[PDB]
Enzyme design. Structure first.
Site, short mmCIF file in Angstrom:
data_model
loop_
_atom_site.label_atom_id
_atom_site.label_comp_id
_atom_site.label_asym_id
_atom_site.label_seq_id
_atom_site.Cartn_x
_atom_site.Cartn_y
_atom_site.Cartn_z
N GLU A 131 99.93 -7.99 -55.25
CA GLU A 131 100.85 -6.84 -55.40
C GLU A 131 102.24 -7.29 -54.99
O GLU A 131 102.36 -7.97 -53.99
CB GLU A 131 100.34 -5.65 -54.59
CG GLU A 131 100.93 -4.30 -54.96
CD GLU A 131 100.41 -3.18 -54.08
OE1 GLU A 131 100.33 -2.04 -54.55
OE2 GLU A 131 100.10 -3.45 -52.92
N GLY A 271 100.07 -6.70 -43.66
CA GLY A 271 99.12 -5.88 -42.94
C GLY A 271 97.73 -5.64 -43.48
O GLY A 271 96.79 -5.86 -42.78
N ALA A 272 97.62 -5.07 -44.67
CA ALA A 272 96.35 -4.89 -45.34
C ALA A 272 96.55 -4.82 -46.84
O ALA A 272 97.58 -4.49 -47.30
CB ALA A 272 95.61 -3.69 -44.83
N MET A 273 95.52 -5.19 -47.56
CA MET A 273 95.56 -5.10 -48.98
C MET A 273 94.30 -4.63 -49.63
O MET A 273 93.31 -5.11 -49.37
CB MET A 273 96.02 -6.38 -49.54
CG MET A 273 96.24 -6.32 -51.00
SD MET A 273 97.51 -5.35 -51.63
CE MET A 273 96.76 -4.69 -53.02
N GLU A 274 94.37 -3.68 -50.52
CA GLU A 274 93.18 -3.15 -51.13
C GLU A 274 92.65 -3.76 -52.41
O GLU A 274 92.38 -3.09 -53.34
CB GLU A 274 93.38 -1.69 -51.32
CG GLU A 274 94.27 -1.34 -52.44
CD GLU A 274 95.70 -1.35 -52.11
OE1 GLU A 274 96.04 -1.85 -51.08
OE2 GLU A 274 96.47 -0.84 -52.87
N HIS A 305 92.09 3.38 -44.61
CA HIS A 305 93.17 3.39 -45.58
C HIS A 305 92.83 2.50 -46.78
O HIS A 305 92.92 2.94 -47.94
CB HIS A 305 94.48 2.94 -44.90
CG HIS A 305 95.68 2.96 -45.80
ND1 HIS A 305 96.75 3.81 -45.60
CD2 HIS A 305 95.99 2.23 -46.89
CE1 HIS A 305 97.66 3.60 -46.54
NE2 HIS A 305 97.22 2.64 -47.33
N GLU A 306 92.39 1.25 -46.53
CA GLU A 306 92.03 0.37 -47.63
C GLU A 306 90.78 0.85 -48.35
O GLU A 306 90.68 0.74 -49.58
CB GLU A 306 91.82 -1.05 -47.12
CG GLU A 306 93.01 -1.61 -46.38
CD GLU A 306 94.33 -1.27 -47.04
OE1 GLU A 306 94.56 -1.67 -48.21
OE2 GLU A 306 95.17 -0.62 -46.37
N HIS A 309 91.28 3.33 -51.05
CA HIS A 309 91.89 2.82 -52.29
C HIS A 309 90.84 2.42 -53.31
O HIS A 309 91.13 2.39 -54.51
CB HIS A 309 92.75 1.60 -52.02
CG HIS A 309 94.13 1.92 -51.55
ND1 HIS A 309 95.10 2.46 -52.37
CD2 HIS A 309 94.73 1.70 -50.34
CE1 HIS A 309 96.23 2.59 -51.68
NE2 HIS A 309 96.03 2.13 -50.46
N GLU A 328 99.81 5.06 -51.87
CA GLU A 328 99.71 4.79 -50.43
C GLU A 328 99.62 6.08 -49.64
O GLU A 328 98.90 6.11 -48.67
CB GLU A 328 100.97 4.02 -50.05
CG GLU A 328 101.13 2.71 -50.78
CD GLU A 328 100.32 1.60 -50.15
OE1 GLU A 328 99.87 0.70 -50.89
OE2 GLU A 328 100.12 1.64 -48.93
ZN LIG Z 1 98.13 1.78 -49.28
#
Ligand SMILES: [Zn+2]
Length: 859
Positions: A131, A271-274, A305-306, A309, A328
């Site tokens: 992304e 931080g994080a990725m889905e 959160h992930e 998604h 998001e």
């Molecule tokens: Zn998000």
């Protein structure tokens, strides 16, 4: 220099092409080698259809070189290839096939296929981050979210390496130092959601047992080896399992991808990725220490959160990136729902209110503010048009959309939406309609009120009561949105009445009404005849995005009874409302401090269970003491406050955040003899506060407090410099040097600070940081008028970036006086840079506000 795809280019390509499938082969065999390795083998075979045979299109790729590219049998001319131009695709047939052999670069930045060598064990770890549009750094693709496809990935790996990807795979030993990892074809996905996670990763495994139409799911967790000792896999697997049981019930759709792997990857930018079925996490979530509960909650939210998604973003993906705020935001909301619904964190809406929501409101009141929804004309726009406000306020207004549609309706239209649009793309409006169908609401105007505007509406209740205390009339008054256009929005909000609980005498909710608030005045007939209790709370349940006011009687009750409010969300709203009424000169500053201090360390903030709220309140209380309180009452105010900080800390749990919070607040406070006495003891072991661990940061803060009051001199600072010398440490020492209370020390700083031409930019801020203090107001009078006199010449002298912090930081917000305000206008007369005037303007307003509240306090 990769391409800046434009909305138009994507729309045109999307019109013409329909991609079916990707087959990717990667040569990662040279990967476990050392730093001299720079490329890997990427062979892409893509099948796609064109609906205008004979037309020209283009496919995206970013590589060292392109060995060959063969469209439909024809070998294409790759001699002119540049990454910014990709691969033109002329003479398209109706059904096409493209094969491309090339050499891609590994990266050390966040993007593409990132490569890392563990400096401790020498092992090499790979992960990908695509992304917004870096998928092209690994394989050839139409890199834009609305040309979905399945992927069949096969990798050739060093034999020590694990290789995790979107789908599950099979490994065959090549017996040449390597292994071959063939992964199943995936379900359809966008390019940026493709994952590759390769290395010698520590690996756990577990499974979510299947239920309610949901099949079982293989789960795994990965992290570097060195970091594996600190991985609390057990906990993470429980929180993952809580999430999977919740989401399919809520959404009504089982997990769409086969398994769920979660990897903790080095040097992670975001931080994080889905990534579908392969979620990545930065390494700070692998707790290497006894860790605070807020961190557990935060991490829990991030996992959730992930996971959200998987459905919203991965199953249904947006069409173009201007729906990135929605993607998001929705996930943020869904994960707080999940936390409250299925995790130990049942106080999550409170956290949301004091962390994300409070932050949104703060940003949205500044002159910098902008709407959630921005125009995204090209890829570069994404990075500059969506910032923290976009997300913090996005989540907060989506929460209000949920309230307005109604939760059960909303969840019901979610299912329509996920089924209607699964494995495909969808706009905001595609989702607004699903919600209209589920609830009968008209949301045609919603985005124009909430997503395209700025600022907050105030809601003040207008009420009358009878001899018995029962409402004879109740109206909600809505004010124009500011700062902004001044529209009146439409809200679904609840109103709660709070009264003494007979058994405990605690304020509990005795009544709740929900209604649509519209326009400048709305009546609440459901409250006519209802007893008004002791506290009336509009926007109860924090369902809408506004500024709230308390009626006079409820306000008086709060001062003496805030800690008795049984629930944390109502109690957090009142902490918020009381501060906003102090900022606006409707709650006397002295009365806010009395709200905060309480009768005892067991009332007021001393009683607040929530760490976020305690921190904010403590910070805001200091601000009320220094600026809103009246000078006559201010000396006493500080003593009362530092007195209470001290007791509160000598009562708190030993390694508790609360105990730390009270220390840090004491650090920045203005102290008396005992405070300095105890604090001095804490830096030494003369009388350690138990459980209070003193790290460098805390030690430095305590010294900065000591030095700032004369209790510690230059020598004391100097020795701490011997204890620790670091880039951070020099700054921390430099702040301490500026704090010493002498005109000579201050004089040194003004010049050194303003004028250190050759000073590092780190150090400039640290010299100013310590230049101000709540308790050195007498010691700073000289610099009031001189800042104005001087700033002109530094603005012409320094750069844009360097000058603004110096003006903002040294703005004399410490002197709240009519004199200083007069000087601001006096300086204001001469023509000056609009950017310089831009700061003096914000700065002056703060002084003005402070002066009006200074006055209300006297009142
Ligand atoms: Zn998000």
């Amino acid at each position: 220099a990769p391409p800046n795809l434009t909305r138009e280019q994507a729309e045109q390509r999307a019109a013409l092409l329909e991609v079916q499938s990707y087959a990717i082969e990667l040569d990662l065999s040279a990967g476990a080698g050392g730093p001299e390795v720079e490329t890997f083998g990427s062979t892409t075979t893509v099948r796609f259809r064109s609906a205008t045979p004979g037309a020209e299109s283009w496919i995206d790729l970013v590589a060292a070189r392109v060995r060959s590219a063969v469209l439909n049998g024809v070998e294409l001319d790759v001699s002119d290839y540049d990454e910014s131009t990709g691969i033109r695709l002329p003479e398209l047939a109706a059904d096409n096939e493209l094969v491309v052999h090339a050499d891609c670069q590994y990266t050390n930045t966040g993007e593409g296929l990132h490569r890392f060598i563990d400096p401790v064990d020498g092992g090499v770890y790979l992960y990908s981050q695509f992304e917004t549009a870096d998928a092209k750094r690994m394989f050839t693709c139409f890199d834009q979210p609305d040309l979905k496809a399945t992927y069949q990935i096969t990798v050739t790996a060093p034999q020590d390496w694990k290789v995790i990807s979107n789908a599950a795979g099979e490994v065959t030993d090549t017996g040449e130092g390597t292994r071959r990892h063939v992964f199943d074809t995936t379900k359809p996905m966008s390019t940026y959601l493709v994952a590759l996670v390769a290395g010698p990763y520590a690996e756990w495994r577990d499974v979510f047992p299947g239920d309610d139409g949901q099949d079982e799911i293989p789960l795994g967790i990965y992290c570097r080896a060195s970091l594996a000792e600190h991985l609390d896999a057990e906990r993470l697997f429980i929180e993952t399992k809580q999430g999977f049981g919740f989401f399919h019930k809520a959404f009504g759709v089982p997990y769409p991808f086969g398994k769920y792997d979660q990897c903790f990857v080095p040097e992670f930018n975001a931080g994080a990725m889905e990534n579908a079925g392969c979620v990545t996490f930065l390494e700070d979530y692998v707790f290497r220490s006894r860790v605070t509960g807020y961190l557990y909650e935060r991490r829990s939210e991030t996992v959730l959160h992930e996971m959200a998604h998987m459905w919203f973003g991965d199953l249904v993906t947006m069409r173009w990136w201007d729906d990135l705020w929605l993607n998001e935001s929705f996930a943020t909301w869904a994960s707080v729902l999940a936390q409250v619904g299925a995790t130990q964190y049942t106080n999550a809406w409170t956290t949301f209110a004091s962390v994300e929501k409070s932050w949104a409101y703060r940003q949205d009141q500044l002159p910098s503010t902008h709407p959630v929804a921005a125009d995204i004309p090209d890829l570069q726009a994404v990075e500059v048009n969506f910032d923290g406000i976009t997300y913090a306020k996005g989540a907060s207004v989506l929460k209000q959309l949920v309230a307005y549609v109604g939760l059960e309706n909303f969840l019901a239209g979610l299912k329509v939406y996920f089924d209607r649009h699964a494995w495909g793309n969808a706009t905001l409006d595609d989702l607004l309609v699903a919600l209209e169908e589920a609830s009968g609401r008209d949301l045609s105007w919603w985005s124009a009120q909430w997503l395209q505007t700025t600022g907050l509406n105030m809601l003040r209740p207008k009420l009358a009561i009878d001899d018995e205390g029962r409402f004879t009339s109740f109206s909600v008054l809505q004010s124009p949105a500011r700062p902004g256009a001044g529209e009146h929005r439409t809200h679904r909000l609840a109103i709660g009445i709070y009264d003494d609980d007979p058994a405990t005498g605690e304020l509990v909710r005795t009544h709740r009404v929900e209604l649509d608030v519209t326009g400048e005045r709305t009546e609440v007939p459901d409250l006519v005849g209802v007893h008004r209790g002791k506290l009336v709370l509009v926007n109860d349940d924090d369902l809408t995005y506004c500024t709230m006011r308390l009626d006079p009687q409820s306000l008086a009750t709060l001062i003496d009874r805030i800690a008795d409010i049984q629930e944390s969300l109502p109690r957090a709203l009142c902490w918020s409302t009381a501060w906003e009424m102090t900022r606006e000169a409707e709650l006397k500053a002295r009365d806010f401090v009395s709200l905060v201090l309480g009768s005892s360390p067991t009332t007021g903030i001393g009683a607040e269970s929530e760490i976020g709220v305690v921190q904010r309140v403590l910070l805001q209380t200091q601000t009320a003491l220094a600026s809103y309180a009246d000078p006559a009452w201010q000396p006493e105010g500080w003593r009362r406050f530092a007195g209470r900080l001290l007791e509160l800390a000598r009562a708190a749990e030993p390694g508790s955040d609360h105990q730390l919070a009270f220390v840090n607040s004491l650090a920045g406070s203005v102290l008396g003899e005992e405070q300095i006495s105890a604090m001095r003891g804490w830096l030494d072991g003369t009388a350690p506060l138990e459980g209070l661990t003193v790290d460098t940061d805390l030690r430095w803060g305590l010294l900065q407090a000591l030095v700032a009051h004369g209790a510690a001199g230059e020598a004391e600072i100097d020795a701490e410099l011997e204890r620790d010398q670091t880039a951070t440490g020099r700054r921390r020492a430099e702040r301490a040097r500026s704090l010493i209370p002498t005109p000579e020390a201050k004089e040194k700083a003004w010049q050194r600070a303003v004028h250190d031409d050759q000073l590092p930019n780190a150090i400039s801020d640290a010299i100013i940081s310590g230049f101000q203090h709540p308790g050195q107001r007498e010691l700073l009078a000289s610099y009031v008028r001189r800042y104005f006199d001087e700033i002109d010449e530094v603005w012409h002298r320094r750069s844009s970036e360097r000058a603004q912090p110096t003006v903002i930081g040294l703005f004399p917000s410490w002197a709240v006086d009519e004199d200083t305000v007069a000087v601001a206008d006096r300086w204001l007369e001469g023509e000056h840079a609009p950017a310089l005037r831009r700061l003096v303007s914000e700065g002056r307003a703060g002084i003005v506000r402070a002066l009006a509240a200074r006055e209300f306090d006297r009142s």
